[PDB]
Amino acid sequence: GKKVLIVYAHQEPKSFNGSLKNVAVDELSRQGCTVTVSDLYAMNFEPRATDKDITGTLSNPEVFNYGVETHEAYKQRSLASDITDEQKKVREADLVIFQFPLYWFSVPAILKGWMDRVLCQGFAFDIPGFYDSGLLQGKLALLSVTTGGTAEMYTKTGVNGDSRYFLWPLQHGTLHFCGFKVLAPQISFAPEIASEEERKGMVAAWSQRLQTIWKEEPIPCTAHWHFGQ
Amino acid sequence: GKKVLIVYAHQEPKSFNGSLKNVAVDELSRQGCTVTVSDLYAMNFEPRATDKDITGTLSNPEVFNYGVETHEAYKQRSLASDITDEQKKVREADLVIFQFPLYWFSVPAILKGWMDRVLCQGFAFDIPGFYDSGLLQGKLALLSVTTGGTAEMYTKTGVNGDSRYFLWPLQHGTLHFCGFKVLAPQISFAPEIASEEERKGMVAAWSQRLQTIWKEEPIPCTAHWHFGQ
Ligand SMILES: Cc1cc2nc3c(=O)[nH]c(=O)nc-3n(C[C@H](O)[C@H](O)[C@H](O)COP(=O)(O)OP(=O)(O)OC[C@H]3O[C@@H](n4cnc5c(N)ncnc54)[C@H](O)[C@@H]3O)c2cc1C
Ligand SMILES: Cc1cc2nc3c(=O)[nH]c(=O)nc-3n(C[C@H](O)[C@H](O)[C@H](O)COP(=O)(O)OP(=O)(O)OC[C@H]3O[C@@H](n4cnc5c(N)ncnc54)[C@H](O)[C@@H]3O)c2cc1C
Ligand SMILES: COc1ccc2c(c1)C(=O)C(c1ccc(N)cc1)=[N+]2[O-]
Ligand SMILES: COc1ccc2c(c1)C(=O)C(c1ccc(N)cc1)=[N+]2[O-]
Ligand SMILES: [Zn+2]
Ligand SMILES: [Zn+2]
């Protein structure tokens, strides 16, 4: 069997992102996978990294260091329950799909907060214990992104540069760092500009890709893959 | 005269980031600049992009589109006061310094939320009306970042790649997109590993640089600057 967590970041159920998340649930459910969705806006997910994330006696209450305190809280089981609830979903998953609209060449802040707070030291990585030695080794991750900009804008000679350039902090700096193997991104370009048929086509391309997702190999998550030369 | 806004994202006043923000206030105040600080954690700044960002009635209450709603709310003066308070600070500033610890090769979510919610359509850019036609042309921006990783890790052949690789979404996709001219980043590597004297040196280098900040030329914010030789 296979277990999938979809971390979804869109405010509107009727959105293009909503449709891509729903087709993923529908297709992976049809295959017999175990599927969980973390709908961050509906959960009112807390994005801020604060001292409210630790319940116990702080390691250094005089000078608050978020990374030190969360690492110690993870080991002591004194983290806030909203974080540990997400960590259980990630621990059980074989594949984590992130479904989101691109905001400033990155994830919306609510989803950035999920990465900041859930992927803590001791859970997702250790120093040492990162990149190929990351604690989430054996798991797959996939970014399914939608954009305002067209595919042409997202080219080497386009005004936004190649789309792989903006993937570096997410695929490499975050997911590969935690040990994930990264599947090729799904980028659904400019659905707002797209015709009704073109939008339908992008939703079906995603559903069709998911039919054979378990046969895919991960990308080589390197600087050469992202930037060339 | 010169006006500066510092957007600061650290939970702890006694932190290394706190010291870099304080020396920036001290030095720019000494020069006679007008200085404002947005201390996002102390403000409990809201990072989530939600329908609470629009006061009164929505353009389309049946299907919520954040970008459409905020663009229309900006034009109709119906944005939440926390957003318009930041927009006034940015509008008045000649230079915007962002002071933050690197979180997942990017800004902490609270600061990502400031970028998502404050730099709205009609205020910072329009569609079309971006990059050289962005609405913050004439302003300068500067990223002052601290890291966990050493300078050696942030090299082309280092495990994290060149530090310029992670700057692309922030400097190009966000700041340049809105029309800012981007000053060279200030990167304070691994202060937690550094000695007491080493950290004092990093703080002093930032204060010293600020003495001549108004004489600096911006970087060429291009793909070649970020990814080339
Ligand atoms: C703060 C902010 C920052 C941004 N920064 C960037 C950036 O850096 N770069 C960039 O390129 N873009 C950026 N954008 C734009 C953003 O990425 C796009 O608006 C977003 O990706 C569009 O996806 P969506 O789901 O919201 O589209 P929607 O507006 O929800 O979808 C478009 C259309 O598809 C229709 N649709 C829904 N479901 C289906 C279906 N099943 N079949 C057919 N049609 C369907 C909808 O009804 C609608 O008409 C930014 C936006 C914001 C708000
Ligand atoms: C969610 C998360 C994600 C992260 N992702 C990344 C990543 O992608 N890449 C990466 O490289 N790092 C990453 N980090 C690490 C993070 O960037 C560093 O921990 C941070 O930059 C350290 O800066 P600081 O201000 O918090 O240091 P502090 O711990 O506050 O500073 C270290 C010391 O400086 C002392 N000090 C304060 N002021 C002075 C002064 N004036 N003179 C001398 N000493 C002084 C303090 O007392 C303290 O002992 C991440 C951390 C977290 C929590
Ligand atoms: C905040 O940054 C952004 C917001 C919305 C955006 C973008 C950046 C785009 O680049 C884009 C966009 C939409 C249509 C065409 N023709 C081009 C770009 N939208 O919507
Ligand atoms: C979330 O990603 C991160 C968090 C903290 C980090 C890093 C990444 C490092 O790479 C690092 C780090 C710590 C000690 C030595 N010797 C090197 C790097 N810290 O602290
Ligand atoms: Zn990688
Ligand atoms: Zn640029």
Residue numbers in the entry:
A (entry chain B), B (entry chain A): 2 to 230
Article, verbatim:
Based on our previous studies, which demonstrated that hQR2 could reduce a large variety of quinone or pseudo-quinone compounds, we hypothesized that hQR2 could play a key role in the bioreduction of these indolone derivatives, because they were pseudo-quinone compounds. In this case, the indolone derivatives would act as substrates, not inhibitors, of hQR2. In the present work, we demonstrated that the anti-malarial activity of indolone derivatives is linked to their ability to serve as hQR2 substrates knowing that QR1 is not expressed in the RBC.
